[PDB]
Design a protein around this ligand. Structure first.
Ligand SMILES: CC(C)C(=O)N[C@H]1c2[nH]c(CCc3ccccc3)c[n+]2[C@H](CO)[C@@H](O)[C@@H]1O
Ligand SMILES: CC(C)C(=O)N[C@H]1c2[nH]c(CCc3ccccc3)c[n+]2[C@H](CO)[C@@H](O)[C@@H]1O
Ligand SMILES: [Cl-]
Ligand SMILES: [Cl-]
Ligand SMILES: [Cl-]
Lengths: 585, 585
């Protein structure tokens, strides 16, 4: 009878109180004079998009929408809320009540009001809305993305689209830090050309319109000089560089020390402290300084329960108000258990920031990382106050994983990776969701075979059916039913990928066409591998020898291609099938 | 001056009691006419081959060999042993004392005297013998090989040479059960043709001369009938077949029920019991009957602590005298822990026989299994009294692993797999042992990528070095010295293999030429992999692309080839290097 639509992030408190109601083609709007401008703009936009007019004069027979903040002078807001408010209720928190023709939205601040509008937009389908009482606020207070990868940086239009996407999903933090922007790191002293400054401006305006904090990152560590007149000259270059962005509206800064040879911990921190003093504190409206030290994962930072020398000196030197990011137990790592966050938090005795290197693929570019947040302790917020993911150079397909990060960082305690992953693809993909899940299911696990591994395993259910096939065959048990089933699975992989090639919008298709072709090749090799097994069981030598040729040729195509998908599953199945001797008789 | 040479098996109690001495050009021999016939005949062969004559006549000044059993009354033996004796040792035990120009060999029985001679043969080098006090006896009472694999059965010459090899290493059991001998299984009812029988006579005679129990296996399970007249006809067929081999001197027999679809536990065990009664006991001089049940690995036999339906019925129907074989926790598995043997021995209420599926490679024929007995509990004799290995269709190279089985089963408590493996190769390959070690080190681990896995990991020390390389490179640490060390290892892999190709005797070379060429190919890819890494460090794109094309080609060659070696080490390393992105900035 509505119902409650898919929502992201999952609201903290949601109660269904009624049958639901249709929103009139024309509404009455109250409070839009005092409410958060940004919030109201996002409301107007949605209303316009959905062919909903705003009444110039009040109308009894119309759906009424009331909007404002807690301390705004708005009587009707108090009334339609009927008891529950956002009072109450941390920063970015809000209350939403839909009941019998009225919709009320109240934020603790303007951010909350904006976010209340985002939930509203998600609640309405076909002008119908469920009847609910919502109170909501984030688990973690900074949530977002660091564009911090190697490779082709996101285009200006990519970033503008990403920023709207963060706002819509309650993500409030975007860190500008592309390794391959020359003015970010390689030529960090050099000022941005005019045309690129105008683009930053648009990005900064876009961030503000969406209640996202734009963080200007800089990475001087390759060749910054520390002592004497050169240290003076270089420190001034940092100040100059930050000022140009500040003067455009930037109020958040990051200075980064990763991926460099120099491990002068005291000098790094001293730079951070001087910048913090002469810029951050001196400007007065600037958020805490953000940094990553040269040791940034637990393997690098810690030896036998104790901080290594670099980490030790850095921790003892960097001012307490500076946000320090770390990536977890490893740079690209399976999990962050609570004990790791506890370890690092105690070392720095401060709440930590997380730089999560997933879905980034810059270290294994042939594979797309399409899985949810996976391995992050649901209790991490005890030690972590700031959470960001490093995405792929592929902006559109990063939205799947980013979508889950939004849910993880806003409602951490109830986060369910499988449900969040499904919900992400449903919400992003529409009619194509079921097919996109088939494909993406095979492309969640990242593994470069050495130091870098993270993500949910690829297609775990299918992997379990494959194992059971081998179990039955080696036990000489009848596998006819399981074989018939696996034909069904392989045919479904291929059909799903074909539907995706024919119907994915180009923005999506351009990022994954090769991996799609790759999964089809694999599915075909998997099918032929079944043919090979079935021939061996039928003692049909010629059907063997013909199926095996196909299987091997598909595996060889898959191995020689740039695109990489389903290594431990669709790919490995062929290898397993070719290594299983059923000619033993 | 003079050290104890490599011995196999490791004697139970050995002590160096002096400096050693040289045996003269001719000796006094004493006890020949009373000591065991096969022991003396083996002794004479050795004396003839090492250009040592026997006095006519006796004295000077000439070294004195005295030989016999405890049951014999030879004074010189008693004087020469000086307190040491075989009197209190188990069957197959012996005493050897070499001191002051005397060598005394006393067996507990004729088997023990023979083994005494075998130890003597290993003790003498260039006429020099260490002065020692040995008492010795096997841990496990039945120690041998079952030729029980699928594929081309060993040739008749193969078998004769194996049987002598078993003698020399104190293995006492040979089970004749090749899956693809028609008359063993496919045509189990049918008599062997005459020329086959003559070959069987030779096998039987050779076994007797080398104290080896020749065990005749029959596998009637595919199509044997049990009920009514058909069941009579078929039972008599078993009798006819056994009689024919008994009539030539066979006194041990096996009836195998493995790898069939018929799970008729009562019928199987009834056939066993009927044969035990009408053949084994009726003859009086036939050793206990040996069997394998259709369920023969713990996974197939047991469901949480308890026997499955078939095993329950088998265990409780089969006569207590019958030796039952099982393979361990799985058909081809990592280990047999004491707890597994306890569990299975519990169900059958007796000491078990082991059929150990290593070094057999019938299920993964591209790889040679050249490693030691690995994963078998060193206390297994508590529940096991019968130990055999299923070897490769490649008889010559099977000797490395068999050699280690001889040590494990004879001296279980002191069994050290690395040392036994080293000794095997030292003792078997002589001048080529160091090169053979390099190559064989890469070919210990069996793994069909699904249900079958067993053996020591391939080249473990190189694997750790590889691991340490990636840990340093991903921490952006200086690895120049290790890089250099690994260039040395890959070069030495290629060198060893080249020498093996040029100098292996043909009978070994014909079994491993393809695998030699595989390891060379991979060493070359490994070397190209290092070059590829070094180029990326130097930001030399041309050298990188060039080394990369080579490393990829070498890999693809190895992957496409029938021969398989060093999957997780030499081969994996190339895959690891290719996925390590060092072009990031
Ligand atoms: C801010 C750091 C936590 C960090 O992750 N720095 C860089 C980083 N460093 C590393 C490990 C060291 C390394 C090895 C090879 C090439 C470049 C870096 C991995 N990463 C990320 C994933 O590839 C990459 O996106 C990121 O820009
Ligand atoms: C007597 C049994 C303990 C036994 O191991 N039987 C056969 C046996 N059965 C099995 C498992 C069943 C099987 C699976 C696939 C193909 C053939 C048999 C494995 N093996 C051995 C290793 O391949 C093979 O040498 C052996 O002859
Ligand atoms: Cl899990
Ligand atoms: Cl193809
Ligand atoms: Cl029958």
């Amino acid at each position: 009878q509505v119902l409650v639509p898919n929502l992201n992030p999952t609201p903290e408190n949601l109660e269904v109180v009624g049958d639901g109601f249709k929103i009139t083609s024309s509404i009455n709007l109250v409070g839009e004079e005092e409410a958060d401008e940004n919030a109201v703009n996002a409301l107007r936009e949605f209303l316009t998009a959905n062919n909903i007019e705003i009444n110039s004069e009040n109308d009894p027979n119309s759906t009424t929408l009331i909007i404002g903040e807690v301390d705004d002078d708005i009587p009707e807001l108090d009334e339609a809320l009927n008891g529950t408010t956002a009072e109450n209720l941390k920063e970015e928190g809000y209350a939403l009540v839909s009941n019998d023709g009225k919709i009320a939205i109240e934020g603790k601040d303007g951010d909350g009001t904006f976010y209340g509008v985002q939930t509203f937009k998600q609640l309405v389908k076909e002008s119908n809305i469920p009847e609910v009482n919502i109170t909501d606020y984030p688990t973690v207070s900074a949530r977002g993305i660091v564009e911090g990868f190697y490779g082709t940086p996101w285009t200006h239009q990519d970033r503008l689209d990403q920023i709207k996407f963060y706002g819509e999903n309650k993500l409030n933090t975007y860190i500008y830090a592309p390794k391959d922007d020359p003015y970010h790191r390689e030529k960090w002293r050099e000022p941005y050309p005019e045309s690129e400054m105008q683009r930053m401006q648009e990005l900064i305006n876009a961030s503000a319109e969406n209640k996202v904090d734009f963080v200007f990152g800089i990475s001087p560590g390759i060749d910054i000089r520390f002592d004497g007149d050169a240290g003076e000259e270089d420190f001034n270059h940092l100040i100059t560089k930050a000022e140009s962005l500040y003067d455009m509206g930037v109020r958040s800064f990051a200075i980064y020390w990763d991926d460099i040879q120099d491990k002068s911990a005291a000098k790094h921190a001293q730079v951070l402290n001087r910048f913090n003093e002469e810029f951050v504190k001196a400007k007065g409206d600037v958020k805490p300084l953000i940094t990553v030290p040269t040791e940034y994962d637990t393997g690098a930072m810690v030896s036998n329960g104790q901080p290594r020398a670099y980490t030790r000196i850095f921790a003892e030197t960097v001012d307490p108000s500076i946000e320090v990011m770390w990536t977890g137990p490893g740079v690209v790592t399976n999990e962050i258990p609570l004990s790791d966050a506890q370890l690092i938090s105690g070392i720095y005795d401060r709440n930590m920031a997380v730089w999560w290197n997933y879905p980034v693929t810059d270290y294994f570019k042939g594979k797309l990382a399409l899985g949810p947040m996976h391995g992050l302790d649901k209790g991490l917020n005890q030690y972590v106050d700031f959470f960001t993911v490093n995405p792929m150079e592929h902006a559109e397909l990063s939205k799947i994983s980013i979508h889950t990060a939004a849910d993880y960082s806003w409602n951490m305690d109830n986060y369910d990776y499988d449900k969040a992953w499904n919900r992400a693809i449903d919400m992003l993909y529409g009619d194509l969701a079921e097919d996109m899940k088939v494909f993406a299911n095979h492309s969640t696990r990242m593994d470069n075979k050495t130091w870098a591994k993270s993500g949910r395993e690829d297609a775990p259910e299918l992997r379990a059916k494959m194992d059971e096939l081998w179990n039955k065959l080696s036990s000489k048990e009848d596998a006819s039913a399981l074989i018939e089933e696996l034909y069904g699975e392989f045919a479904r992989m291929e059909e799903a990928c074909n539907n995706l090639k024919a119907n994915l919008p180009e923005v999506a298709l351009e990022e994954c066409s090769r991996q799609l072709d790759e999964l089809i090749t694999l599915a075909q090799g998997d099918k032929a591998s079944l043919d090979m097994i079935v021939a061996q069981l039928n003692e049909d030598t010629e059907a063997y020898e013909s199926a095996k040729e196909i299987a091997q040729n598909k595996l060889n195509t898959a191995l020689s291609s740039f695109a990489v998908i389903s290594e431990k599953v669709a790919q490995s199945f062929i290898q397993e099938a070719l290594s299983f001797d059923l000619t033993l008789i």
